[PDB]
Amino acid sequence: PQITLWKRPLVTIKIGGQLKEALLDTGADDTVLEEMNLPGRWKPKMIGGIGGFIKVRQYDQILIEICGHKAIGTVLVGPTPVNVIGRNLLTQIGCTLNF
Amino acid sequence: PQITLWKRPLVTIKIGGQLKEALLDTGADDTVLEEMNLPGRWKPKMIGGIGGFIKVRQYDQILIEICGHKAIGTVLVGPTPVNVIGRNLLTQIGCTLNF
């Protein structure tokens, strides 16, 4: 599909057996999702942006479906105000910017 | 152009007659640039990101050229970790997401 940017580019994703809403975010290196109790091992990380840093849990090789497109990679879980699909997964679903 | 996302989507911008590097950020509603001198009036504003809120100087109706495409719109100036081009200007240059 083609998504215009008049409004936030929100899509439905499937992760951990749950459906959520997330932004297709070309400014996020990696994917960051709202607090969720995923199974498996993780490693602590600190990620910074406007306003400062938040603490997150880094889970590797997590399966995510984004608008029916399957992907697998790193997901950072923590107290983010929004779910963002980052470049690490956007490349996997074939997403580009065009103008 | 069609821009893939294996690397950060960094581009050259022109604002106030100076060239700069900036990130095309579909997850940003607004455009936020690092501290710089900009002519004209401005009003104090607050913006929130992943890590909380910061104080910015809001410049309205500013000419800015992004990878050869002209825009005129609001530019927030303040202690952002990186220059971000957000949707208020991405729409002006006709940028969409495609996969």
Ligand SMILES: CC[C@H](C)CN(C[C@@H](O)[C@H](Cc1ccccc1)NC(=O)O[C@H]1CO[C@H]2OCC[C@H]21)S(=O)(=O)c1ccc2c(c1)CC[C@@H]2O
């Ligand atoms: C530094 C470049 C940008 C800022 C990096 N961000 C991604 C941007 O799209 C954020 C997304 C977002 C965060 C909160 C609420 C809504 C949207 N938008 C943003 O701040 O927008 C501002 C300006 O416009 C306004 O509208 C929205 C908020 C205001 S990040 O979320 O901070 C991030 C993600 C992954 C990762 C990191 C850092 C570090 C490694 C890891 O990979």
